[PDB]
């Protein structure tokens, strides 16, 4: 299995690593129909989302999608620094695939 977020991210197409080294600036969570999602921003101006489950997701990802939202909420509340984000860049805002936190 991969050992780093960078190694993991490269196993996929349409992904990009973003070096954030910062805490989340804003957290947005929606339960509005068809938009059950979370959007996070950074002081840097970059915006990312955890996508609404859909056709392209494999079953195994459903639980992971819920976990990611859980992680982003607590990471935001605790003002924890995010190291890197592996994101799918064929979505707008970019879609979070993986996250890493250091220290």
């Amino acid at each position: 299995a991969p050992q780093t977020i960078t190694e993991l991210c490269s196993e996929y197409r349409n992904t990009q690593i973003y070096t954030i080294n910062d805490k989340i600036l804003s957290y947005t969570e929606s339960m509005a129909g068809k938009r059950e999602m979370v959007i996070i921003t950074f002081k840097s101006g970059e915006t990312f989302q955890v996508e609404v489950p859909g056709s392209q997701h494999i079953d195994s990802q459903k639980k992971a999608i819920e976990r990611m939202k859980d992680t982003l909420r607590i990471t935001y509340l605790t003002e924890t620094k995010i190291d890197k984000l592996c994101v799918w860049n064929n979505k707008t805002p970019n879609s979070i695939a993986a996250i890493s936190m250091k220290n």
Copy 2:
């Protein structure tokens, strides 16, 4: 693919954005039959609710409803400031569709 809560809020009918910029004053949680909901208030005087799951909610929203209630609780306990709320105004009290937090 909204980038902000206001943009997200505009995709729905009967919604409005409330700029709160404050922590939740009261948190009320009910497990009474047909009243399984959460109600929050702000010192401003606004009261909002996370509705009881009903026939108007699609299947994707069920988990989102539970997530929102989780978010409101932890947000209240941590005295975290809420920035904006996207709410449905055809309900009394207004029903939360999305929340955003900043700082």
Copy 3:
């Protein structure tokens, strides 16, 4: 929908509002068969339970019961002040229907 715990409590038969305005003194949790419940007490000596799910509960209450237990545990751990409790008084200890927390 109700806007306050008092308004909400008044919608049911066999309920009464207890003004606590204090943190929980003790938290008891049981996983013993047929006694899967939580019991909380206050300095005042007042004691309350979240009932074991039974035939009197409607399906929609099942997840609300679990949420209420989650809520009591975290408010206990955080020393959070409980404002009022809406409880059914035809059970001993009185059974928690709704809880409100405020400044």
Copy 4:
């Protein structure tokens, strides 16, 4: 329903109350097959387990078993004092049936 852990505990076969009045010393969590359990110890030398779900547990206990594990982990992480433990003593280590906390 019982009003205290002592009363609750007395309702079962093969159980005894342990007055611990101390925070958990060590927390062990296993996800190894047929050993998905939690083990906790105290300075006094007492060791207790939350049993792996088994053929002796009724359905309603399944959710309670998972809750108990959640409770022990957060109690450990928060250095919260455990008041008493009601345990089944026909198991080694003794199996947790209920726990109470005060302070």
Copy 5:
């Protein structure tokens, strides 16, 4: 039932105990398809994973896997020191079977 992580670890083949006595340095979480896993590292250079659920896992382990990921996240966020780890060493990075922490 085993009484210590060391005893529990011994019951398995291809396992090994790691004495860490340190907080997690970094936490990486992935929801990328087929890589829904968590990777943690320590200052020492040790890297461990919570494997993606697969054909090697039995019924009861599925919930335990999710629990372990929850634990690692909260342990990381709280900078809680990890004492020992029981890992399967026929995986790269080594796969976590059990974790123990002492306060």
